[PDB]
Amino acid sequence: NSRDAGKVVDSETAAICDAIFQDEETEGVVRRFIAEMRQRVQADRNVVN
Amino acid sequence: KEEHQKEVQYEILQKTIPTFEPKESILKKLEDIKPEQVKKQTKLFRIFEPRQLPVYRANGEKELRNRWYWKLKRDTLPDGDYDVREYFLNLYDQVLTEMPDYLLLKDMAVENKNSRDAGKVVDSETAAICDAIFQDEETEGVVRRFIAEMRQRVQADRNVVNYPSILHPIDHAFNEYFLQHQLVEPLNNDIIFNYIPERIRNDVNYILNMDRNLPSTARYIRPNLLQDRLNLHDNFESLWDTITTSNYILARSVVPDLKELVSTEAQIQKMSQDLQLEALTIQSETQFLTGINSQAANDCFKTLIAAMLSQRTMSLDFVTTNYMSLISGMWLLTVVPNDMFIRESLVACQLAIINTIIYPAFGMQRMHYRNGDPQTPFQIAEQQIQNFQVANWLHFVNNNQFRQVVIDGVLNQVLNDNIRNGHVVNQLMEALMQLSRQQFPTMPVDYKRSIQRGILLLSNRLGQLVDLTRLLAYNYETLMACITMNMQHVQTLTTEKLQLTSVTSLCMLIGNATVIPSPQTLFHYYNVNVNFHSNYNERINDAVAIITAANRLNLYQKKMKSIVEDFLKRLQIFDISRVPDDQMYRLRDRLRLLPVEIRRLDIFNLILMNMEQIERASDKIAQGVIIAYRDMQLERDEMYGYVNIARNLDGFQQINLEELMRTGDYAQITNMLLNNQPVALVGALPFITDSSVISLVAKLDATVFAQIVKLRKVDTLKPILYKINSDSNDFYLVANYDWVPTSTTKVYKQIPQQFDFRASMHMLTSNLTFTVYSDLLAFVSADTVEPINAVAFDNMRIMNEL
Amino acid sequence: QFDFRASMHMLTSNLTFTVYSDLLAFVSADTVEPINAVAFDNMRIMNEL
């Protein structure tokens, strides 16, 4: 449910993200947030967030 | 065990390096790299076609005449603007997959049936238009007379031709691009003579002659021998190691096998008595004389040249007890530069020589060397030894390094020109003769004599080793000429083991048989490097094109290593389940930060100035839908009748849908639908044709939005496009009762492009009958002189001790 | 309460490094011939006939 189709760290984190995007009772700002949240790389430092 | 545990950890390292399994398999693949197999077709590029369609005059009645309009071939356009832009990218890449390199128009032209002048046209799908536009009752007389008088213009004495064509302007743009930007250049023998390297057609040992003709029609394609703009020599060490290994294995396949050498057993029988191993209490009484065979001499001769060409850093496996290996390795350290070796093993060998030969000769207490020191054992010994001979030899050695010269635009790691001629070995043998005459003040005498005689076993190979060194340097430089990619010096991860026995072989089993590469092994090697280099640049260009096109079409979804893996994979030397991740991201970075090849850019620019016009055809989607809750009036068109059509998209709060299907935030639209605020939902989406006036009266257009609130996903959105006309079964209701067809829910869509002949007839220009040769060293008759009479760069003969 | 935004953190780490347990596998080694074996005094051991 991500804009850039990125990644997250662990399967339960993804489960929670996929649980909160599907519930009718949840809000739109969180779904925007869930669309934003991606992984950032920087290879000249060999570092990932 | 310990050796298995080494194998495990060497395996841990080798599971980081993209070098294929068994190494000799690479030689199948480098040879199987074919050039850019040139392309040409027998059909023009065509995205549209004319088509004869209904029309409906105002009042909604059907006219008694169809009309010609442009419509796409093979409507397959998806829904949602992301997938549309993906479609245009998947058009771009396949255009590139079929983007030609040279065209010829005689190979596709056909006769116009209605011509009273024996005329021609370019394609079948344009003659199929010309007959229909001829027979039609609406076309004007000037067009008919023109069609009957469309005479082409062939002209062989200037080699050109001009043919008529019917084309949509976009298609004309693509085709005139392909015509005006052919990547073929004229050809003649002086180019090929000026395509061979300089210092082979100056080398007198290689006879080159021309024995074939090339007419003015002959063509070729100049490959893209442009240098490494990815810069794999800083922080791409695995990949550089892979390239290095590939060139190394290629280099083994071209060095000649040397013949007419010294008998093996003849050397063994005399070494055994020159060293007198039948008098010593050592643990090596049958182990010094192992690894002397052929299959190791020539293997070393291949290993050395291949490593110096490829810059493959190499290590040293050596048992320190065998001092003949060290005496044969000091020759190596003299002629082969020091930077070519890993520092630790080189230092080890030097330290062995110093603490086993040199200092125990000169009476010096041994050493205490910090391995963690930038200063090197020979550099100490140059200052501490008091003897001008050995000190000047070591001075040469310490300052023996490659030199970075620039030849033919490319880089070269070249030698000193005191190695190219064998002259330093005279200094070596003077130092060694001095060590022979010198005692060893503290050493056992039986072992002293053994070393003192083992040294003389090289003192007698003086002229022979001169000959060897000159031979080595000659073959090295001659094969260096047939290299394109910059030979760059880098320390590599993994490292070829060199057994010093296989030097001791070479330094004691050779004489008087000059073997140099044939001119065709040279051409094979050169074609391989050329083809690899051209493939390398022409795949970098494609990768950069797709990447830049993605970032310029806003296809943020697409992961970029799926492209890079195909880029690495098509270069047939890399394994990609093997390769790391961080290197891939650094390569992504350094690929985005490059220019773009001009053809790959021009095609893209053509697609971007037309995608907004190409997507407005394909009558299965609309470009948005307006919603406005005032009883608006359907506006008459000519293709459709009355319609809920829009063409301006103004005075309405626009809302885009690709930002909405992903970010589920329907507050800003649920608070407009429910309260009936006018909007315009923009995005490529389907529609349907509803030709029931009773549905218009029933207001079926407003029923297809109240599922967005139930099902958040905007994909099952299928608006209405009322087309009503004489063949709609309730059209009488429009035309009798004196009222106004009215609705809401206008659809945003631009009418098709009407066919005009003047703006679509064109004259396409081309050359004729030029042949496009590819393998152009076949036009070079090459030969070599006998090996017995071969001369090096200095004009003096090579292997002079005849 | 589960505040989604507040409970979201970007975890830092390296990218694609290797680890080596046995560290003396790369160091190959050899001895000198035992006759030319020397002590702290730079004078050979077992040279007394």
Side-chain angles (χ1 to χ4, degrees):
Chain A
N1 290 310
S2 180
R3 181 183 290 278
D4 294 335
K7 289 183 185 288
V8 297
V9 71
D10 191 358
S11 296
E12 296 190 0
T13 300
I16 296 160
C17 293
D18 295 336
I20 291 169
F21 187 84
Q22 295 288 323
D23 294 333
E24 294 292 329
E25 297 296 332
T26 55
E27 294 292 329
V29 297
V30 296
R31 294 187 180 92
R32 291 178 184 273
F33 188 77
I34 292 161
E36 290 175 354
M37 60 188 286
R38 65 179 179 88
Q39 60 89 36
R40 291 195 294 269
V41 298
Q42 58 188 359
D44 293 331
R45 295 181 176 178
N46 293 317
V47 173
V48 180
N49 293 329
Chain B
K1 295 295 291 181
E2 293 293 329
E3 299 179 353
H4 185 277
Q5 194 179 6
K6 290 174 69 63
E7 186 65 27
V8 173
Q9 191 185 343
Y10 288 160
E11 193 276 338
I12 290 164
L13 180 55
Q14 191 68 40
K15 294 294 289 186
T16 307
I17 295 162
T19 303
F20 282 148
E21 297 296 330
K23 301 292 188 290
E24 294 294 330
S25 298
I26 299 164
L27 189 62
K28 181 67 181 296
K29 294 180 182 180
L30 292 167
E31 296 178 354
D32 284 331
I33 293 163
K34 299 293 189 291
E36 300 292 326
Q37 183 174 358
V38 71
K39 292 182 284 187
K40 182 181 89 273
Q41 71 286 18
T42 187
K43 189 179 286 190
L44 292 176
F45 185 72
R46 289 179 181 273
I47 301 302
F48 297 97
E49 59 182 1
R51 179 66 66 191
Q52 182 171 3
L53 299 169
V55 299
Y56 297 94
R57 62 173 71 85
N59 73 2
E61 292 186 356
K62 186 168 181 174
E63 293 178 353
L64 294 169
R65 63 181 181 174
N66 291 321
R67 184 178 288 169
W68 293 93
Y69 285 88
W70 291 103
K71 294 289 180 73
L72 290 169
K73 295 185 177 186
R74 297 287 179 177
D75 292 325
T76 57
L77 279 79
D79 296 329
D81 288 331
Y82 176 83
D83 291 328
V84 174
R85 294 193 296 273
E86 188 67 26
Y87 180 75
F88 285 108
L89 181 62
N90 294 321
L91 194 152
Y92 176 68
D93 65 355
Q94 64 188 358
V95 170
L96 293 178
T97 299
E98 78 193 4
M99 180 172 65
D101 295 331
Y102 72 96
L103 282 75
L104 291 172
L105 298 178
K106 280 181 91 290
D107 298 333
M108 60 182 76
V110 298
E111 65 183 0
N112 189 2
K113 276 74 68 175
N114 286 318
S115 183
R116 300 291 181 181
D117 286 329
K120 293 188 173 68
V121 295
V122 70
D123 186 71
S124 178
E125 284 82 1
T126 182
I129 297 164
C130 291
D131 64 355
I133 302 301
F134 186 85
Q135 288 175 352
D136 190 76
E137 193 264 331
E138 187 64 26
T139 302
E140 59 268 22
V142 297
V143 174
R144 290 192 295 269
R145 296 292 298 278
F146 183 69
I147 286 168
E149 298 180 356
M150 290 198 294
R151 185 63 173 80
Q152 69 277 15
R153 181 67 58 78
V154 179
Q155 185 167 3
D157 57 358
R158 293 189 295 179
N159 201 359
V160 304
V161 298
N162 294 308
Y163 288 102
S165 69
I166 291 166
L167 291 171
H168 189 271
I170 290 165
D171 299 332
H172 181 77
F174 282 97
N175 287 310
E176 69 88 19
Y177 188 80
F178 297 165
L179 290 170
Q180 297 292 323
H181 293 285
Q182 295 178 359
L183 52 81
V184 294
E185 296 187 357
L187 182 66
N188 49 1
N189 284 315
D190 64 356
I191 292 168
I192 300 162
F193 183 75
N194 288 119
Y195 180 82
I196 298 167
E198 184 64 24
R199 65 180 181 276
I200 289 168
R201 62 179 188 267
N202 303 113
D203 195 357
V204 298
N205 289 324
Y206 290 97
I207 295 92
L208 303 176
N209 294 112
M210 293 292 168
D211 291 330
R212 292 178 69 93
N213 197 7
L214 292 169
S216 65
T217 63
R219 299 291 191 271
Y220 74 105
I221 293 167
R222 187 181 65 187
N224 197 352
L225 275 66
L226 191 63
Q227 292 296 322
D228 191 1
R229 61 193 191 279
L230 296 175
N231 290 313
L232 296 172
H233 64 93
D234 53 354
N235 200 351
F236 287 101
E237 294 292 328
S238 296
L239 298 170
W240 183 248
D241 192 356
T242 305
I243 295 165
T244 306
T245 295
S246 296
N247 291 322
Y248 178 78
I249 296 299
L250 184 64
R252 293 180 66 84
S253 65
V254 299
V255 171
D257 296 330
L258 59 88
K259 61 182 286 187
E260 296 292 330
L261 53 79
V262 178
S263 295
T264 61
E265 63 273 19
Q267 292 290 110
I268 299 301
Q269 281 109 27
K270 71 182 286 293
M271 293 171 73
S272 299
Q273 63 179 359
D274 287 326
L275 279 63
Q276 191 183 358
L277 281 71
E278 299 296 328
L280 282 65
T281 313
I282 63 165
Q283 298 292 322
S284 300
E285 66 188 1
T286 310
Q287 287 74 18
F288 287 10
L289 294 167
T290 55
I292 303 298
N293 60 356
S294 296
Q295 306 178 353
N298 57 10
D299 193 359
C300 180
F301 182 72
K302 291 185 180 182
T303 298
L304 295 170
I305 298 167
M308 290 195 286
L309 294 168
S310 65
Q311 296 290 316
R312 180 67 173 169
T313 292
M314 61 187 174
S315 65
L316 299 171
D317 187 72
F318 64 98
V319 178
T320 65
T321 66
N322 190 0
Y323 59 85
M324 291 300 296
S325 294
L326 301 171
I327 294 164
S328 298
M330 58 167 71
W331 179 78
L332 183 69
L333 295 172
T334 302
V335 305
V336 172
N338 297 321
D339 60 355
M340 180 53 61
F341 294 102
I342 193 166
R343 293 291 300 274
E344 287 84 4
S345 71
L346 183 143
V347 167
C349 184
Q350 291 185 356
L351 186 64
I353 293 164
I354 292 161
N355 297 119
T356 305
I357 304 301
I358 305 298
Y359 284 9
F362 293 97
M364 291 180 180
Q365 68 178 1
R366 300 284 285 267
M367 188 173 281
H368 296 89
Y369 184 72
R370 273 73 182 177
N371 56 7
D373 188 357
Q375 198 179 4
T376 306
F378 284 178
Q379 295 176 351
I380 292 91
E382 187 182 2
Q383 295 295 318
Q384 293 291 320
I385 296 294
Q386 290 178 355
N387 190 354
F388 290 101
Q389 293 294 324
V390 61
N392 194 357
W393 173 63
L394 298 171
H395 182 75
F396 182 83
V397 170
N398 288 319
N399 293 316
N400 190 2
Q401 289 89 22
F402 290 106
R403 290 175 180 82
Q404 293 82 21
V405 69
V406 179
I407 299 160
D408 195 358
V410 309
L411 187 68
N412 295 114
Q413 297 288 326
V414 295
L415 277 69
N416 196 356
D417 201 354
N418 289 316
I419 298 163
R420 299 178 65 191
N421 60 354
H423 188 267
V424 62
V425 302
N426 289 306
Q427 186 67 46
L428 175 58
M429 297 301 163
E430 286 180 351
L432 285 178
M433 284 184 287
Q434 183 63 43
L435 291 169
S436 299
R437 297 177 294 172
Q438 190 180 356
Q439 66 182 359
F440 284 84
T442 305
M443 182 176 284
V445 299
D446 61 354
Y447 186 76
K448 176 167 79 72
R449 289 195 297 271
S450 72
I451 296 169
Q452 193 184 350
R453 290 170 175 165
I455 293 163
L456 295 174
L457 266 73
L458 274 74
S459 303
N460 314 133
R461 302 287 297 169
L462 170 61
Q464 280 64 236
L465 290 168
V466 171
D467 300 332
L468 170 58
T469 303
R470 296 180 73 191
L471 183 63
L472 186 64
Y474 181 75
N475 293 319
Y476 175 60
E477 66 183 4
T478 56
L479 294 167
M480 186 193 289
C482 298
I483 291 169
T484 65
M485 299 182 75
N486 284 316
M487 62 196 292
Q488 285 174 349
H489 181 271
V490 176
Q491 291 290 107
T492 62
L493 277 65
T494 183
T495 304
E496 295 294 328
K497 302 303 297 295
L498 183 63
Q499 301 292 320
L500 295 182
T501 59
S502 62
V503 179
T504 303
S505 300
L506 185 63
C507 293
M508 301 299 291
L509 297 167
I510 187 165
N512 302 121
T514 306
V515 294
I516 59 168
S518 175
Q520 294 298 112
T521 61
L522 294 176
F523 295 167
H524 184 70
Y525 187 62
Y526 181 68
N527 293 123
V528 171
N529 290 322
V530 166
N531 287 324
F532 182 79
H533 199 192
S534 175
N535 190 7
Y536 181 75
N537 284 319
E538 293 295 326
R539 296 284 79 73
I540 292 169
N541 287 321
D542 294 329
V544 172
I546 300 294
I547 290 167
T548 300
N551 293 323
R552 290 182 184 181
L553 294 173
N554 195 5
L555 298 175
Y556 53 85
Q557 285 280 321
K558 186 179 283 193
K559 185 69 183 73
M560 296 178 69
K561 65 170 72 180
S562 65
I563 297 164
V564 177
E565 68 179 2
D566 185 74
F567 169 65
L568 273 77
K569 181 180 175 181
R570 293 290 299 277
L571 296 173
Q572 296 285 327
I573 61 175
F574 296 110
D575 189 359
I576 299 161
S577 295
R578 181 64 59 81
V579 68
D581 294 330
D582 58 355
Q583 294 179 1
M584 299 291 286
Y585 289 105
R586 284 194 288 270
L587 186 55
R588 190 271 306 283
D589 296 334
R590 294 186 183 179
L591 287 166
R592 294 181 295 179
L593 294 171
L594 290 175
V596 183
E597 197 275 331
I598 299 92
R599 303 183 80 201
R600 294 178 173 87
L601 185 66
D602 293 336
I603 298 294
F604 183 74
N605 300 124
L606 287 173
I607 294 165
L608 268 72
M609 65 187 282
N610 296 316
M611 64 190 286
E612 185 270 334
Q613 184 173 1
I614 289 167
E615 189 268 327
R616 291 179 181 276
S618 182
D619 298 329
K620 288 184 284 185
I621 58 170
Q623 292 82 29
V625 67
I626 295 163
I627 304 162
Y629 296 93
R630 61 181 188 269
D631 198 4
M632 292 187 286
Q633 66 93 27
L634 302 175
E635 63 186 1
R636 296 178 175 85
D637 293 335
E638 187 65 25
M639 293 298 290
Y640 301 97
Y642 294 96
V643 285
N644 59 359
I645 196 166
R647 70 283 303 278
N648 298 114
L649 186 66
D650 57 355
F652 293 99
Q653 182 178 354
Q654 292 78 10
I655 294 167
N656 192 354
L657 299 169
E658 61 178 0
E659 287 78 2
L660 184 62
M661 61 178 287
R662 300 191 182 284
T663 58
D665 195 358
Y666 292 89
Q668 194 262 336
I669 191 169
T670 56
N671 201 5
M672 304 187 85
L673 297 179
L674 300 173
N675 302 116
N676 291 320
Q677 296 184 2
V679 296
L681 304 175
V682 298
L685 51 82
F687 62 94
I688 57 178
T689 60
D690 185 77
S691 183
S692 180
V693 179
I694 301 304
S695 299
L696 184 67
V697 174
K699 297 180 177 64
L700 186 64
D701 60 358
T703 64
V704 296
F705 295 104
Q707 62 184 353
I708 293 167
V709 306
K710 184 179 184 293
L711 300 171
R712 294 192 300 267
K713 61 185 285 183
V714 58
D715 292 327
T716 180
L717 184 61
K718 185 171 176 180
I720 306 300
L721 180 63
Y722 295 110
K723 71 186 290 294
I724 66 97
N725 48 10
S726 172
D727 57 358
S728 68
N729 295 318
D730 51 359
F731 183 75
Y732 63 94
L733 296 172
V734 177
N736 302 126
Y737 292 103
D738 190 358
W739 60 285
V740 181
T742 57
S743 178
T744 185
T745 304
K746 291 189 292 191
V747 175
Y748 180 60
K749 185 172 176 65
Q750 294 291 321
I751 194 69
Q753 182 179 359
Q754 186 178 356
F755 181 77
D756 186 73
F757 183 75
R758 291 180 179 81
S760 178
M761 178 266 172
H762 293 286
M763 295 296 292
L764 296 171
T765 186
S766 178
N767 295 109
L768 291 175
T769 59
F770 59 88
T771 61
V772 177
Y773 297 100
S774 296
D775 186 74
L776 53 86
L777 289 172
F779 297 101
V780 179
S781 63
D783 196 73
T784 187
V785 300
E786 293 290 330
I788 191 70
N789 52 5
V791 296
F793 67 96
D794 63 354
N795 197 3
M796 185 180 288
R797 74 184 71 192
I798 190 174
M799 308 190 77
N800 196 358
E801 185 63 25
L802 302 175
Chain C
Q1 179 177 357
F2 175 72
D3 188 357
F4 191 81
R5 280 83 62 79
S7 296
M8 176 266 178
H9 298 284
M10 297 296 288
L11 300 175
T12 64
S13 178
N14 284 321
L15 182 60
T16 302
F17 60 90
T18 68
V19 182
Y20 296 94
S21 297
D22 190 0
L23 200 64
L24 295 172
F26 297 99
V27 175
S28 61
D30 193 74
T31 61
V32 301
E33 182 177 348
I35 191 67
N36 284 316
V38 73
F40 68 95
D41 58 356
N42 291 112
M43 186 179 174
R44 183 181 289 117
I45 58 173
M46 193 176 285
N47 55 5
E48 297 297 326
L49 302 180

